[PDB]
Paper text:
Cholinergic neurotransmission in the brain is terminated by the hydrolysis of ACh, which is catalyzed by two cholinesterases (ChEs): acetylcholinesterase (AChE) and butyrylcholinesterase ([name]). The assumed co-regulatory function of [name] in termination of cholinergic neurotransmission in the healthy brain changes in brains of patients with progressive AD. In specific brain regions of these patients enzymatic activity of [name] is increased. Altogether, these data suggest that [name] is a potential therapeutic target for restoring ACh levels in the brain and thus improving cognitive impairment, while also minimizing adverse effects in patients with progressive AD.
Specifically, the positively charged nitrogen of their piperidine moiety engages in cation-π interaction with the Tyr332 side chain, while the attached benzyl ring fits into a groove contributed by Tyr82, Tyr332, Trp430, and Tyr440 side chains, in the choline-binding pocket. The naphthalene moiety is T-stacked (i.e., π-π interaction) to Trp231 in the acyl-binding pocket, while one of the sulfonamide oxygens forms a H-bond to the hydroxyl oxygen of Thr120. The type IV inhibitors revealed that variations in the N-alkyl substituent on the sulfonamide nitrogen were permitted for maintained inhibitory potency against huBChE, although its removal was not. As observed already in the complex structure of huBChE with compound 128, no conformational change is undergone by the enzyme upon binding of compounds 2, 7, and 8. This observation suggests that the active site of huBChE is fairly rigid upon binding and that tailor-made compounds are required to achieve potent huBChE inhibition.
Residue numbers in the entry:
A (entry chain A): 3 to 529
B (entry chain B): 4 to 483, 485 to 529
Amino acid sequence: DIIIATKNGKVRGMNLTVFGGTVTAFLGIPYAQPPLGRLRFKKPQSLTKWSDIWNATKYANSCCQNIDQSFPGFHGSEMWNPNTDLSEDCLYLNVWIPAPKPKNATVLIWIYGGGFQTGTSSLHVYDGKFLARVERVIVVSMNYRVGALGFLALPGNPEAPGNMGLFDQQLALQWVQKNIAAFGGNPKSVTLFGESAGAASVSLHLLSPGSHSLFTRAILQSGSFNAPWAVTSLYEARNRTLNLAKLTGCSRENETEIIKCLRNKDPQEILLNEAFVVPYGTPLSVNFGPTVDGDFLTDMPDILLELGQFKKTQILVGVNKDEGTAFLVYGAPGFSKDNNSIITRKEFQEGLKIFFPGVSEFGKESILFHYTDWVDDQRPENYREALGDVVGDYNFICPALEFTKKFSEWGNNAFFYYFEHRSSKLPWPEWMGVMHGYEIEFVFGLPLERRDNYTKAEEILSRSIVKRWANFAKYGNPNETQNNSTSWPVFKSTEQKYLTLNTESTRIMTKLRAQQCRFWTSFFPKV
Amino acid sequence: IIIATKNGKVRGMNLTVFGGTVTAFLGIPYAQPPLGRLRFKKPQSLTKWSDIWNATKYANSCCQNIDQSFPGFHGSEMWNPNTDLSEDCLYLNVWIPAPKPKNATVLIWIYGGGFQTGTSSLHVYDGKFLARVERVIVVSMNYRVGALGFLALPGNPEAPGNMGLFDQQLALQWVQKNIAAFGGNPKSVTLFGESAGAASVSLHLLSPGSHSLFTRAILQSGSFNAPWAVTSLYEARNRTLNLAKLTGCSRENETEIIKCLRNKDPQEILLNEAFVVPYGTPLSVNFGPTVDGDFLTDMPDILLELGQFKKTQILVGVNKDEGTAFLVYGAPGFSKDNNSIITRKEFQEGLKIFFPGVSEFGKESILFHYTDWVDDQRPENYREALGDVVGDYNFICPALEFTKKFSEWGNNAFFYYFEHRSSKLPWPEWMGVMHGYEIEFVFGLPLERRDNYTKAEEILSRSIVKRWANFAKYGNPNETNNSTSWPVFKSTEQKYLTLNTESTRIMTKLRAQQCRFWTSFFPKV
Ligand SMILES: *[C@@H]1O[C@H](CO[C@H]2O[C@@H](C)[C@@H](O)[C@@H](O)[C@@H]2O)[C@@H](O[C@@H]2O[C@H](CO)[C@@H](O)[C@H](O)[C@H]2NC(C)=O)[C@H](O)[C@H]1NC(C)=O
Ligand SMILES: *[C@H]1O[C@H](CO[C@H]2O[C@@H](C)[C@@H](O)[C@@H](O)[C@@H]2O)[C@@H](O[C@@H]2O[C@H](CO)[C@@H](O)[C@H](O)[C@H]2NC(C)=O)[C@H](O)[C@H]1NC(C)=O
Ligand SMILES: *[C@@H]1O[C@H](CO)[C@@H](O[C@@H]2O[C@H](CO)[C@@H](O)[C@H](O)[C@H]2NC(C)=O)[C@H](O)[C@H]1NC(C)=O
Ligand SMILES: *[C@@H]1O[C@H](CO)[C@@H](O[C@H]2O[C@H](CO)[C@@H](O)[C@H](O)[C@H]2NC(C)=O)[C@H](O)[C@H]1NC(C)=O
Ligand SMILES: O=S(=O)(NC[C@@H]1CCCN(Cc2ccccc2)C1)c1ccc2ccccc2c1
Ligand SMILES: O=S(=O)(NC[C@@H]1CCCN(Cc2ccccc2)C1)c1ccc2ccccc2c1
Ligand SMILES: *[C@@H]1O[C@H](COC2O[C@@H](C)[C@@H](O)[C@@H](O)[C@@H]2O)[C@@H](O)[C@H](O)[C@H]1NC(C)=O
Ligand SMILES: *[C@@H]1O[C@H](CO[C@@H]2O[C@@H](C)[C@@H](O)[C@@H](O)[C@@H]2O)[C@@H](O)[C@H](O)[C@H]1NC(C)=O
Ligand SMILES: *[C@@H]1O[C@H](CO)[C@@H](O)[C@H](O)[C@H]1NC(C)=O
Ligand SMILES: *[C@@H]1O[C@H](CO)[C@@H](O)[C@H](O)[C@H]1NC(C)=O
Ligand SMILES: *[C@@H]1O[C@H](CO)[C@@H](O)[C@H](O)[C@H]1NC(C)=O
Ligand SMILES: *[C@@H]1O[C@H](CO)[C@@H](O)[C@H](O)[C@H]1NC(C)=O
Ligand SMILES: *[C@@H]1O[C@H](CO)[C@@H](O)[C@H](O)[C@H]1NC(C)=O
Ligand SMILES: *[C@@H]1O[C@H](CO)[C@@H](O)[C@H](O)[C@H]1NC(C)=O
Ligand SMILES: *[C@H]1O[C@H](CO)[C@@H](O)[C@H](O)[C@H]1NC(C)=O
Ligand SMILES: *[C@H]1O[C@H](CO)[C@@H](O)[C@H](O)[C@H]1NC(C)=O
Ligand SMILES: *[C@H]1O[C@H](CO)[C@@H](O)[C@H](O)[C@H]1NC(C)=O
Ligand SMILES: [Cl-]
Ligand SMILES: [Cl-]
C-alpha cells in the first residue's frame, strides 16, 4: 500500500508504469480549505487535519473559469480546456515521485498559464510522470483560482484584497516546504517553472518577500511580469471590481456590502460578466489579474526590479519563435486557422486597431513602418507574418529579454533560450509556426513516449530539454553533458548570448531581435 | 594493501603494468576542504581520521571553466576534467613500484592549465608507467584554480592570493611527512610540471617556504618570467573589484566583498571570471600568482637577478611549435579544420588580438622582424610567422632567459628542444609540435604497445622517461653506450639537446635572433 503521512493526515497514492519503471503519483491532495461561501474572494485559509486516509488517486476539480469554445472538436483549442469538473472547491495539488523512493530529490513545481483567467494542472501536457521517471525529480503542481474569483481587488480590504490566486500558489509552496521531505524531496532544492501567465507568476514570486524562502530557482517560459498584459494598476483593478458589481446588481455604498453581494451570486453569473468590465479589450486582455495589493506586491513590479529588491538566485528564461500567431485567429480580420491567412496592407492596419486600441494614428503608422522593410516585396506572406511578429515581440519576446537584462545586472547567472521547433503533431496550420504554449509538451517529455508517433528527432530534442531543465534545478546550470554538447553561456547585458533549441542545430547567438525590440523599448513608450 | 600516514590509514590498489605490478593510492586528502568560511583562504592542515580512507578512485577535480570550443573533439576534451567538479578537491595521488622500494626518489607533478583549469587525474598524467619502468615514486596533486585559487586582496588573510600555490606547498609538505611510510625518500624529491605547472615549479624555487620541500626542478614549456605568468598587484586589484561588480558583491569594505563572494554559487564565480579583464587574449590569465608578501616576498624578476633562491640543478625545455594551439582560440583565418593560410593583413589582425595594447609602430616592428622569408614564395609563410611570434614571446624566449640567469649562480642547468610530432595527434598537421604534447612522452604513454604509437615513438619515449628519472635520482639527465651526452647549459656557449626520433644533436643559442627582438627591442616600443 502507497501511503505517506503529511502533517494534515495520511494520503494514499497510485503506481504508474513509465518506461519499464515505476512512478508513484498522488493526484488531488488538498492544500487549503475550500474557498467556499464566506471564504469567497479571500486569501486561502490553511488546512486543518483529517483522520481518514485521503485517496489522492484522481485529479481534482478545476477552478471556475470560462471555456474556449471557438472551435468545437478542435484538439488545438480544446487541449487547453479543463479536463475535470469545475467547482469553487479546487485548491488541490499533485505529486509525482520517482520509484524507488528518493532520499533528497530536487523538486520542480509547475505553475500553469492561461491569462490568469483559465488553466488547470490536470491537463495532459502538464503530466509530471516523465520528468520524475527520466530525471529522478519530484514534480508538483497546484490548482489556483483564476478570473474574478482569483484576482478581484478592493485593495486593502481583507474581504477581497487582490492577488488571491498568487497566494494560492504561495500556500502550495508552503505545503511543499512543510511536507515534501516525507515524500523524499529536498525542500532546499525547489525550482519553480511555468509558462505564460504561469511564468509571469514565477517572476512575481521572485519579487514577493513572502515567497523568497519557499523556493530556490526560477524557470520562465514565454512570460514575465513586465509584459504589457501581466499587471494591472491598483486603481484600474478596483474600477473593474465596481463595474462587475454594477453588471450583477451589486453596486453598494460601502465596499464590504459589494463583496457580501458578490458572495451570494452564483459563479456563472460572475464568469458571465467578467468580459464586460474592460471598455474595449484585445485578445490579450486580462480582465482580473495581479495588481499592486500592498501585500503580495508592495510596489509596481518595475520599481522593485529596478531597485534590486528581489530574490537573488539563478533564472532560466526563454521564448518561442512564433509567440504572436495564436492570437491573430482570435480577433484579427482576415485570419482563419483553416486558410493560409494572406492579408493586405489595410487588413494589417485593422489588425493593429484590434491589438492597439488606444494608440494614436501616428503610433500605429510607426509600428507599421518598423515592420515593413521587406527583404522581398512579394512574398504575399509579408503582412501576415509582420502582424504575428508585432504581437509576439511587444507581448512576449522583448519583455522577457528586458527582464533577463535587468535581472542579470544584479549579479546572478541568467540563461536565455529561443525555442524554434514546430511540433510534428501540432494541430494548428503551418503558417502559425512555433506557437505560444507548444514547447510545454517538450519540456515535460511527452516525445519520450514512443507509442505516441513523434519523430525520433523530437525524442532527442525533448530528451535534451528535460535534461537541461532538470540539471538547472539541481545545479543552477542548464548543462547536458560535459562533452559532446553545446555550452549554454550566461546572458550578460553586454553580449546578450542565448541558446537556440531545435532539431537541426543548437547554436549560441547574440542580441535576439534587437532591431525589433529597440522600437518597443525606446520608441513606442514615447508615443 | 594498507599504509599508515601520520593522520590515519589509507588503502591502495594494484595495477598490472607491463607484466609487473604498480601499487596506486588515488585520492588521498591532504588538507581540509576549502568550503564555506574557508573559501579563498590558505589550505588548512588536516586532522587525523580514525577510519581507513580508501584511496582507490581519483577524487574531485577543483571547480573550473571547461573548454567546449570543439564538442566531440579529442584534442580539446582530453584536457577537460574527468572527475566531478567540486570545491572539495584538495587530494593527491601516489604511485609506488612493486615490490615496495625502501628509498625511492620521488617525482612530483604539478599540472598546468593557465592557472584557470587542470587536474591531476588526466590520462596523460598517469604515473603508473614511470613507477613501473624506473622504480620512482610519482605523486600528483589537485590545487585550486581561477579566482577560487588566486583571488587576491593583498594583506588580508581572508583572500590573500596564491592560495593555489600554497595548495601545492601543502601537498609538498605531506610528501615530506609521509612518503617514507610508502618507501620514498623525502631527501630526493624533484618537482616537474608543464606550462603553468612549470611556472609553478619555478616559483617554488623562489619561495623560501618551499626551499626545504624538494631537491631539484624540471620546467616543461613555462617559467615565471613568461608574460602571462604573474599578475601585478595593480592588475589583481582591478580584477578583484571587477569580479565583485559582476557578481553583485561591490561593498565599501574588503572583508565585506569577500563575505559576499563566499555566498555566491561557484558557477556565479566561474562564469564571471572571463569579464574581469577588458582586453583579453587567448593567453589571458584572469587570476594568477601575485606578489602577495608571503609566498612571494618580492617581485620574481628581482629575486632572480639578486640570487635570492634555492640553488640546485634544473632541467628546462620547450617544444618546436608552442604558439600554434592559441591561434585557433581567437586569431582570424585560423581553424583546426583547414590549413589556415593567411595574408599579410590577416597577420596584422592576429597581432592585434595577441597584442591589444601595443602601438601601431611596435606591431609593425614585430611584423618586420618575422617576415625576412628564406623562401618568399610559400603561402604558409604568414601562418608560420604568427605561431612563431606567439611561441617565442610567450614560451621559448622566457625559458632561455630564465635558464641563462639561473645558470649564472653556479647551478648545473640542462636545456632541451622537443621536436617530435606525435603520430596520434588529433590536431591538424600545420600546428606541428604543439604546446602540451610532449607530456605523453614524459609519462611513458607510448611504452604501451597495444596503443597505436609507432616503434620510434616507444624508443623516444623510453629515453625521455629514462633521462628524466636519472635527473631526479642523480642530478644529471644521462642515459644508457650509444647515447648522446647532455651538456650543461652555460651563458656563453648556450648548449641544448634536441629531442626527436631521427637524431638527437647538440646545438647552441636556440632561436637567438628571434629572442634578441623580445629581450632587446620589444621592451622599448
Ligand atoms: C580596471 O577596471 C575598469 C573597470 O572595468 C570593466 O570591464 C568590463 C569588461 C567589465 O568587466 C566591468 O566589470 C568593468 O567595469 C576598466 O575600465 C574601463 O576601461 C575601458 C578602456 O579600455 C573603457 O572603455 C571602459 O568604459 C572603462 N569602464 C569603466 C567602468 O571605467 C579599466 O580598463 C581596468 N584597468 C586595467 C588596467 O585593468
Ligand atoms: C555524440 O554527439 C553528437 C551530437 O552533438 C550534437 O548534439 C547536439 C545536441 C549538440 O549538443 C551539438 O553540440 C552536438 O554536436 C551525436 O550526433 C548526431 O548524431 C545523430 C545520430 O546519433 C545524427 O542523426 C545527427 O545528424 C548528428 N548531429 C550532428 C553530428 O550534429 C554523435 O552521435 C556523437 N558524436 C561523437 C563525436 O561521438
Ligand atoms: C552539470 O554541471 C554541473 C556543474 O554546475 C555538475 O555539477 C557537480 O555535479 C556533481 C554530481 O555529479 C556534484 O556531486 C558536485 O557537487 C557538483 N558541483 C558543482 C560545483 O555544481 C554536474 O555534474 C553536470 N552534469 C552533467 C550531466 O554533466
Ligand atoms: C538534503 O540536502 C540538504 C542540502 O541541500 C541537506 O542540508 C544540509 O546542508 C544545509 C545547507 O543548506 C545545512 O542546513 C546543513 O549543513 C544540512 N542540513 C541538515 C543536516 O539538516 C539535508 O540534510 C539533506 N537531507 C538528507 C540528505 O536527508
Ligand atoms: O484567459 S484567456 O482568455 N484564455 C483564453 C485564450 C485566448 C487566447 C488563445 N487561447 C489559448 C491558446 C493558447 C495557445 C494556442 C491556442 C490557444 C485561449 C487569456 C487572456 C489573455 C492572455 C494574455 C497572454 C497569454 C494568454 C492569455 C490568455
Ligand atoms: O586553461 S586556459 O584558461 N584555457 C584556454 C586554453 C587556450 C589554449 C588551448 N587550450 C588547452 C590546450 C592545450 C594544449 C593543446 C590544445 C589545447 C585551452 C589557459 C589560459 C591561459 C593560458 C596562458 C598560457 C598558457 C596556457 C593557458 C591556458
Ligand atoms: C473606471 O471604469 C469606468 C468604466 O465604466 C463602464 O461601465 C461598466 C458597467 C462597464 O460595463 C464598462 O464597460 C463601462 O466602460 C470608467 O467610466 C471610469 O472612467 C474608469 N476610471 C475611473 C477613474 O473611474
Ligand atoms: C478511500 O477508499 C477507501 C477504500 O480503500 C479502497 O480499499 C483499498 C484497500 C484499496 O483497494 C483502494 O483502492 C480502495 O478504493 C475507503 O475505505 C475510504 O473510506 C475512502 N476515503 C475517503 C476519504 O473517501
Ligand atoms: C506498487 O509498486 C511497487 C513497486 O514497483 C510494488 O512493489 C507494489 O506491489 C505496488 N503496489 C500496489 C500496486 O498497490
Ligand atoms: C573502502 O573500500 C573497501 C573495498 O574493499 C570497502 O570494503 C570498504 O567498505 C570501504 N571503506 C570505506 C569507504 O571507509
Ligand atoms: C635515503 O634513505 C636513507 C634511509 O635511512 C637515508 O639515510 C638517506 O639519507 C636517504 N638519502 C639518499 C640520498 O639516499
Ligand atoms: C567593514 O564594514 C562593516 C559594515 O558594517 C563593519 O561591520 C566592519 O567592522 C568593517 N570592517 C572594517 C575593517 O572596516
Ligand atoms: C578556415 O575556416 C575558418 C572558419 O570556418 C574561416 O574563417 C577561414 O576563412 C578558413 N580558411 C581557409 C583557408 O579555408
Ligand atoms: C587504435 O585504433 C583502432 C582503430 O583504428 C581503435 O579501435 C583502437 O581503440 C585504437 N587504440 C587505442 C588504444 O585506443
Ligand atoms: C479565411 O477566414 C475567413 C473564413 O470565414 C475569411 O473571412 C477569410 O477571408 C478567409 N481567407 C481566405 C479564404 O483566404
Ligand atoms: C598486488 O595486489 C595483491 C592483492 O592484495 C597484493 O597482495 C600483491 O602484493 C600484489 N600482487 C598481485 C598479483 O596483485
Ligand atoms: C649516470 O648516472 C650516475 C650519475 O652520474 C652515474 O653513477 C652513472 O654511471 C651514469 N651513467 C651513464 C651511462 O652515464
Ligand atoms: Cl496558456
Ligand atoms: Cl596545458
